[PDB]
Structure formats: C-alpha cells, structure tokens
Design a protein around this nucleic acid. Structure first.
Length: 115
DNA sequence: CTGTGCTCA
C-alpha cells in the first residue's frame, strides 16, 4: 500500500505546478468554468450543491485538478470534505483509500493527455 | 483494484 503511494505520489509531484494550495482555489475561482466544478472549489459545499454522491463529487474534482497540472497528495487529501473518511478517519484507513482513488483518477487523466 | 467513480455503449 504505502510503497505504491510513494511511486504514485512521485508522479503527481513531478506533474505538480509547485504552487501551494492557496493558489489553486484562487486561480480556479477567478476563471469562468462550469458552476459544478467552480462552486465546489469556491464554496464550503462538496456534493449537496449538485446533489451528487460524495464519492463522485470527489472523483470529478480530483480529475479536474490533474488536468490543471496542480495534482499533489497534500492538496488532494486536504480539499476533501468533512463527509469523507479520507480525513475524518471514521474507521476505514485513509492510506489505502488514497492509493485506490488516486491510482484510478490519475490513470484516467494521464492516458487522456498522453502523446 | 481493500468503499465505487468516466466515455462515444
């Protein structure tokens, strides 16, 4: 689990813009993307704004930051809502949750922008 | 992939 995270996050860090998370929401909220992705980044909502499942609300937001080239485990894990087990640690381990979600979400984007 | 996510089917 943890060793796959080390190689996976290395590929996210080498694709990261190097800017801190405080710039990620700032540069998104000044743009005019669709209300769905913008309102989730620019307000305390996370799924209740679009009435989507909390699993897919996180999935769509994670894919969007990977296309902006600002992906990083620190940003991706911190932006999650209080309804996510990823930071609430209700009972399920967050380390294996991260490896599952990032492995799929990152695989989808990198094959989407490959050349 | 151990809690599931999309896309033209």
């Amino acid at each position: 689990t943890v060793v796959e995270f080390e190689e996976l996050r290395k590929e996210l860090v080498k694709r990261d813009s190097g800017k801190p998370v405080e710039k990620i929401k700032e540069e998104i909220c000044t743009k005019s993307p669709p209300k769905l992705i913008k309102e989730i980044i620019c307000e305390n909502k996370t799924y209740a704004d679009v009435n989507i499942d909390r699993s897919r609300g996180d999935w769509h937001v994670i894919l969007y930051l990977m296309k902006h080239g600002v992906t990083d485990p620190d940003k991706i894990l911190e932006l999650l809502p209080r309804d996510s087990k990823a930071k609430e640690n209700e009972k399920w381990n967050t380390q294996k949750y991260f490896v599952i979600t990032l492995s799929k979400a990152w695989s989808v984007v990198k094959k989407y922008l490959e050349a």
